[PDB]
Amino acid sequence: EPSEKSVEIMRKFSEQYARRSGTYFCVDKGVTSVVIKGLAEHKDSYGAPLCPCRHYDDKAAEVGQGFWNCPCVPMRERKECHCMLFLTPDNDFAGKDQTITSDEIKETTANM
Amino acid sequence: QTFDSFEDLLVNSDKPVLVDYYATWCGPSQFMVPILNEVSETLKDKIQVVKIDTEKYPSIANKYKIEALPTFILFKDGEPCDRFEGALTAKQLIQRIEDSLK
Ligand code: SF4
Numbered sequence: 001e002p003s004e005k006s007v008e009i010m011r012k013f014s015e016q017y018a019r020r021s022g023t024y025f026c027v028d029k030g031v032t033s034v035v036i037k038g039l040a041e042h043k044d045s046y047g048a049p050l051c052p053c054r055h056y057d058d059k060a061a062e063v064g065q066g067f068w069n070c071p072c073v074p075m076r077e078r079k080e081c082h083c084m085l086f087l088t089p090d091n092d093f094a095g096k097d098q099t100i101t102s103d104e105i106k107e108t109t110a111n112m
Numbered sequence: 113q114t115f116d117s118f119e120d121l122l123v124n125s126d127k128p129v130l131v132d133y134y135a136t137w138c139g140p141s142q143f144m145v146p147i148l149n150e151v152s153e154t155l156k157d158k159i160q161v162v163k164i165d166t167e168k169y170p171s172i173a174n175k176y177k178i179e180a181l182p183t184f185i186l187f188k189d190g191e192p193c194d195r196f197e198g199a200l201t202a203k204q205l206i207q208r209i210e211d212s213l214k
């Protein structure tokens with residue numbers, strides 16, 4: 001499991017970055033929550049929040065390259081987020097929330 | 113499940129095979145598991161569905177050059193005939209499968 005400290009850090013980061021990029025969380029905040037825990041797990045394992053919605057030949061090496069450390073280059077370049085963490089408001093899966101609470105994460109990832 | 117057992121499944125199946133290449137801590141991937149399970153039931157007599165944990169079987173993920181997760185590949189006669197990435201609704205998923213078939 002990711003540590004609670006890492007999860008809280010990544011949760012607050014996600015709220016801040018959504019506000020700074022003008023993006024919104026998914027209507028299904030279970031998607032948001034799983035991604036935040038995956039980012040936190042990678043941060044604990046490798047030392048940076050490598051994107052969890054991607055296959056890598058070598059995660060450690062890719063952390064060193066930096067392209068996919070959240071916020072990844074496609075998100076910084078064109079607000080493309082394969083994780084559906086940060087959605088543009090025209091996206092069919094976007095809600096209007098830029099808030100993800102600790103309770104939302106706990107309730108939707110409890111079985112994990 | 114293994115690199116070899118997966119390859120043998122693809123070569124022997126009498127139906128098209130839809131493969132979901134997933135990871136546990138990917139939110140879109142987890143979102144698609146129940147949707148895919150509903151679609152698998154709706155299409156039970158037309159396709160076989162297989163799910164591959166790309167973190168446990170990276171050899172398979174490397175063979176198919178999997179990038180974003182989830183990736184879905186639809187195989188016909190052992191050969192990929194369509195491929196897509198990310199979340200989609202049940203209706204979109206059924207429509208995409210039925211497309212690539214015809
Ligand atoms: S796709 Fe990029 S911005 Fe979105 S969660 Fe993965 S690393 Fe972060």
